[PDB]
Amino acid sequence: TLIELMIVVAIIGILAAIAIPQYQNYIAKSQVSRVMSETGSLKTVIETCILDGKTAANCELGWTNSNLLG
Amino acid sequence: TLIELMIVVAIIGILAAIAIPQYQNYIAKSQVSRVMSETGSLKTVIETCILDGKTAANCELGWTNSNLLG
């Protein structure tokens, strides 16, 4: 019957119009948190350099490239 | 001969006096059935409008004029 197909179309339209929870707030936040870790891991060496008295060129950084540009 | 003509007249009288089967019922029933179908065709759009939440003025009918006023 036509009414059943029209009900099916109405259900499809209802499902297609679901509200998107704006996921950008999540992803970016996690990314920032990740940076908060990586740069934080450097606090160990820099302090160890400063308390040792080495210059900037003599301070060895065990830094590996991060895909978020650090 | 006269008797042959009178027999012809009698046969004409019998043929003219046939019983009419009261055909009004068939025409009335057919018209009512077609009005039934035409009005039931609007159930789909009315139900979709009601289940969608539209107001009376915002429900668009596909109705076209019917030669029967119903």
Classify A70 as helix, strand or coil. coil
- Using a CB-CB cut-off of 8 Å, the residues of chain B touching A2 are 44
φ/ψ (deg, to 5) at B5: -65, -40
Cβ contacts of residue B42 below 8 Å, gap of 6+? B61, B63
Cβ contacts of residue B61 below 8 Å, gap of 6+? B42, B45
Q: Which two tokens stand for residue A40?
A: 């934080």
Instruction: List the resolution, Å.
Output: 3.1
Q: Could you tell me if A7 lies within 8 Å of chain B, comparing CB atoms? A: yes
B residues 14-43 closer than 8 Å to A (CB): 43
Q: Specify whether the CB–CB gap between B38 and B64 falls below 8 A.
A: no
| Yes or no, beta carbons of A3 and B44 under 8 Å apart | yes
Using left for φ > 0, alpha for ψ between -120 and 50, and beta otherwise, residue B30 falls in alpha
How far is residue B55's CA from residue B7's CA, in Å, rounded to a whole number? 75
How far is residue A38's CA from residue A25's CA, in Å, rounded to a whole number? 21
- Nearest CB neighbour to B52, from listed A2, A3, A10: A10
List the determination method: cryo-EM
Q: Specify whether the CB–CB gap between A68 and A58 falls below 8 A.
A: no
| Yes or no, beta carbons of B48 and A2 under 8 Å apart | no
